[PDB]
């Protein structure tokens, strides 16, 4: 039983728009912050790579559905490119070509018995909105509402699963370095917190919008996808345990405390540590933005499920390090990784499958067992079809998740593997491979071909169990 998926559990795979679509300026699409980064700052990206073509999924979406059907995916999670739909960011102009494209993908999926799951924002902000300051500027909350309305109106008759934002803990860091993630702004400890504040407001506006304008007719569900690493105490001390709790609150709780708790607001430890640090460093005002009581009430409860993006673990010990000001410094933990853990092609990603089970339990206890949909989980290598490391990564993580479900009572309701295919890996370009399908980026046809991991995942999806040969 511990090796069998619940009957209603949904299995599939996932992608993101900039990572796969290409057609970056085709048929009216406007520029986004990733177009800007890869065009203006190729020195920030391995090989000077761009997403101009990527997997060419704008043209090849039927091939994506074909491989999803082969895989036996029940669900496909993909994102919508804001600037493909609203080229100016604001809702004054709707690009029919973008409407047609996503309709064509949705219809193709449904005709092949695959459910669409749509992420509204996976990091590709229209440049016109970044030029107002981007996420640190609260005006973007209403702009996000208006974007979401166009999506609900056009697609919500057929799309019943939505995520507002993907991994805002990661994308907020685009406001914490001059050479980092788009838009590559150096405001650590100040602008990144403002970005988070706006995103939380935006998410809440989108959820209320669904309630007010769409839910009764459409009957779908709206969540948010949060990334989080497990943080294991470096030793069993109370002090090291405290540092790991700090980590969870500063990374997951930053977003999840305002939305998923009865109390709402940011975690107390976040408010208190930033307040103290700001005062000590001479600021009149805390660097952490504040919610009013009315905003706290508006934001709390804005969820039908929790999306989780899980990859890895860190070790945490008591202490403070990092630059002043920064979120890492404010968090009051010293982070390392254990040399013994298996590696990947990504410096940040080590294989720690039991950390997945620990994280799922932490979430269950902190948020009163919300329905959890694993929206990303996956592994990098440098290439190859005989991807034994990736096969092991998936079979172990899925076993740990199934223990969380069956042994620990965690309400996990679905899982989409990251990623369906090798794609543009952000600042790493095409150098790191996360796909279960390989893609030849030197071949203009961008053929997708199954790796061993795709064959193993198909077997899991078909049999609805972990095969015997992968069991402990
Ligand atoms: O692009 C791969 C994957 O990255 C995720 O972010 C990583 C980040 O790169 C790393 O520095 C940090 O320690 O861990 C996070 C994951 O928690 C991002 O969240 C994913 O959405 C993305 O697909
Ligand atoms: Cl066997
Ligand atoms: Na419209």
Automatic annotation (TrEMBL):
GO terms for molecular function: beta-glucosidase activity. The keyword Transport does not apply. GO terms for biological process: carbohydrate metabolic process. It comes from Neotermes koshunensis. The active site is at 376 (nucleophile). Homodimer. PROSITE patterns: GLYCOSYL_HYDROL_F1_1. Keywords: Glycoprotein, Glycosidase, Hydrolase, Signal. This is beta-glucosidase. Belongs to the glycosyl hydrolase 1 family.
């Amino acid at each position: 039983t511990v090796y069998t998926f619940p009957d209603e559990f949904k299995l599939g795979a996932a992608t993101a728009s900039y990572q796969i679509e290409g057609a970056w300026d085709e048929n009216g699409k406007g520029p986004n912050i990733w177009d800007t980064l890869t065009h203006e700052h190729p020195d920030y990206v391995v090989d000077g790579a761009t997403g101009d073509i990527a997997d060419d999924s704008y043209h090849l979406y039927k091939e994506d559905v074909k491989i999803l059907k082969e895989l036996g995916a029940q669900v496909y999670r993909f994102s919508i490119s804001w600037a493909r739909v609203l080229p100016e960011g604001h809702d004054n102009i709707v690009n029919q070509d973008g409407i047609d494209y996503y309709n064509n993908l949705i219809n193709e999926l449904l005709a092949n018995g695959i459910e669409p799951m749509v992420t509204m924002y996976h990091w590709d902000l229209p440049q016109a909105l970044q030029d107002l300051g981007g996420w640190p500027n609260l005006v973007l909350a209403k702009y996000s509402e208006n974007y979401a309305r166009v999506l609900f109106k056009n697609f919500g008759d057929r799309v019943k699963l939505w995520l507002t934002f993907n991994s805002p803990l990661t994308f907020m860091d685009g406001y914490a370095s001059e050479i980092g993630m788009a838009p590559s702004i150096n405001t650590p400890g100040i602008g990144d917190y403002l970005a988070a504040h706006t995103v939380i407001h935006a998410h809440a506006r989108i959820y209320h919008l669904y309630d007010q304008e769409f839910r009764a007719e459409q009957g779908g569900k709206v969540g948010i996808s949060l990334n989080i690493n497990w943080c294991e105490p470096a030793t069993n001390s109370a002090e090291d345990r405290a540092s790991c709790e700090n980590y969870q609150q500063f990374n997951l709780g930053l977003y999840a405390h305002p939305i998923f708790t009865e109390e709402g607001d940011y975690p107390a430890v976040l408010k208190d540590r930033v307040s103290r640090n700001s005062a000590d460093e001479g600021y009149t005002d805390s660097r952490l933005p504040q919610f009013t009581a009315e905003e706290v009430e508006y934001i709390r409860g804005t969820h039908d499920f929790l999306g989780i993006n899980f990859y890895t673990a860190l070790l945490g010990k008591s202490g403070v390090e990092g630059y002043e000001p920064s979120r890492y410094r404010d968090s009051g933990v010293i982070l390392t990784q254990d040399a013994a853990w298996p590696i990947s092609a990504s410096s940040w990603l080590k294989v720690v499958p039991w950390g997945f089970r620990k994280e799922l339990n932490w979430i269950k206890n902190e948020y009163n067992n919300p329905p959890v949909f694993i929206t990303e989980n996956g592994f990098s290598d440098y290439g190859g079809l005989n991807d034994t490391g990736r096969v092991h990564y998936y079979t172990e993580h899925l076993k740990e998740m199934l223990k969380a479900i069956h042994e620990d009572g965690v309400n996990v309701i679905g899982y989409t593997a990251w990623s369906l295919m090798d794609n543009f890996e952000w600042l790493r370009g095409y150098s790191e491979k996360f796909g279960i399908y390989a893609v030849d980026f030197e071949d203009p046809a961008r053929p997708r071909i199954p790796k061993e991991s795709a064959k193993v995942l198909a077997e899991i999806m078909n049999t609805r169990k972990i095969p015997e040969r992968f069991r402990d």
